[PDB]
Amino acid sequence: FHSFSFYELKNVTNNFDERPGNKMGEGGVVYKGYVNNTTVAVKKLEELKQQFDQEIKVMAKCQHENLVELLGFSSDGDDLCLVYVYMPNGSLLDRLSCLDGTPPLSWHMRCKIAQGAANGINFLHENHHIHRDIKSANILLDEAFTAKISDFGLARAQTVMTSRIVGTTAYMAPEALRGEITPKSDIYSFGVVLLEIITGLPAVDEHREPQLLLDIKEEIEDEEKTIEDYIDKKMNDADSTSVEAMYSVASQCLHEKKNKRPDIKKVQQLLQEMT
Ligand SMILES: COC(=O)N1CCN([C@H]2CC[C@H](Nc3ncnc4ccc(C#N)cc34)CC2)CC1
């Protein structure tokens, strides 16, 4: 990776222009820039340095079509910047909420994104990495709306435990909330992402009943609700067979027992059969 000068980065971003005009960031703060006349994303950041070091270490060995591409970094400055190829269509989270007036994603786009995200996670697991923060805010979208997994700062290379429990509560598997580190926890988080794709609903909403999205799985299983009551209404091209095939994958990912969950290869294979 290229070791960019802080002065070069500090100014490809107009002295880190906090007005939306270079800012956007919510990772770390992300700024848009231009280096070797490539549009770039400059993410400006103690334990923060450890997450910076881990980001470069994971990015060094993990290069895939469904993972963000790190181009460089800056450390000899004031301080800690990570340079990536810019993702013009932002996050899956933002696009699901139609932030800033963007059109809703079609079912066809959503199927290609679920498939892409799964291929990205499969690569990580084959390369013996546990992401630990799988969520729609960490699924980025390029110029063709190709899903790219991001944020490897908390990544690790069952039976493993930690005294510093990390991740996003609304996406976390029960064992992850207790400190276990397992690739099975990434499967659970991906199940929540599949529910976000089907429903267009965020994983957590304080002003909603139920507050947590994963709670709909029980409403459907108790015959209290159907997946059809929850399908995002901002689509015209969804069909029952593929929505049901995707919900069945999400439901399997969301098994409370980590051992009963499918592996990423099974998930990837099921989403492929869905199309
Ligand atoms: C009020 O709230 C907003 O306006 N919001 C919500 C947060 N959003 C995100 C900001 C960061 C952005 N992140 C990025 N954007 C482009 N390219 C990238 C390449 C790599 C990486 C990484 N690792 C990150 C990137 C994704 C969207 C922007 C709108």
Distance from C-alpha of 25 to C-alpha of 43, rounded to nearest angstrom: 7
- What is the maximal distance between C-alpha atoms in the chain? 60
Nearest Cα neighbor of 268 from 147, 151, 172 is 147
Find tokens 């994603």 and name the residue: 105
Of 203, 156, 204, nearest to 184 by C-alpha is 156
Rounded to whole angstroms, what are the CA distances from 149 to 26, 60, 160?
15, 15, 23
Contact call for residues 87 and 46 (beta carbons, < 8 A):
no
Extract the tokens encoding 242. 């593929």
Unique residue bearing structure tokens 């209404």: 233
- How far apart, in whole angstroms, are the C-alpha atoms of residue 264 and residue 66? 14
Residue closest by Cα to atom 26 of ligand 1: 90
The answer to whether 32 is a known ligand-binding residue is no
- In sequence order, the β-bridge partners of residue 23 are 31
Is 133 annotated in the active site?
Answer: yes
The residues with which 156 forms a beta bridge, in sequence order, are 130
From the DSSP assignment, how many helices (H) and strands (E) are in the chain? Answer: 8, 9
Provide the token pair at 112: 């290609």
| 41 CB near ligand 1 (under 6 Å) | yes
CB of 87 closer than 6 angstroms to any ligand 1 atom? yes
From 17, 100, 133, 205, the catalytic residue? 133
Resolution (A): 2.3
CA–CA distance, 42 with 39 (Å, rounded to integer): 10
Q: Is 138 annotated as a binding residue?
A: yes
Spatial contact of 170 and 203, defined as CB atoms under 8 Å apart: yes
Strands 39-44 and 29-34, by their bridges, are antiparallel
- Is there a binding annotation on residue 43? yes
**Tokens standing for residue 222:** 């108790």
As a whole number of angstroms, the distance between CA 26 and CA 41 comes to 12
Mutate to test the pocket of ligand 1, among 30, 102, 143, 150 (most ligand atoms within 8 A of CB): 30
Contact in structure between 270 and 245 (CB atoms under 8 Å): yes
Q: Which residue type sits at 267?
A: V
Structure token pair of residue 66:
């469904």
Q: Which domains does the chain have, with CATH numbers?
A: 1-86 (no CATH), 87-275 (1.10.510.10)
Residue nearest to atom 4 of ligand 1 (CA): 24
Axis-axis angle for helices 184-199, 107-126 (nearest 10)? 170
Cβ–ligand 1 distance for 247 under 6 Å, the answer no
In angstroms, rounded to a whole number, what is the distance separating the alpha carbons of residues 58 and 132? 13
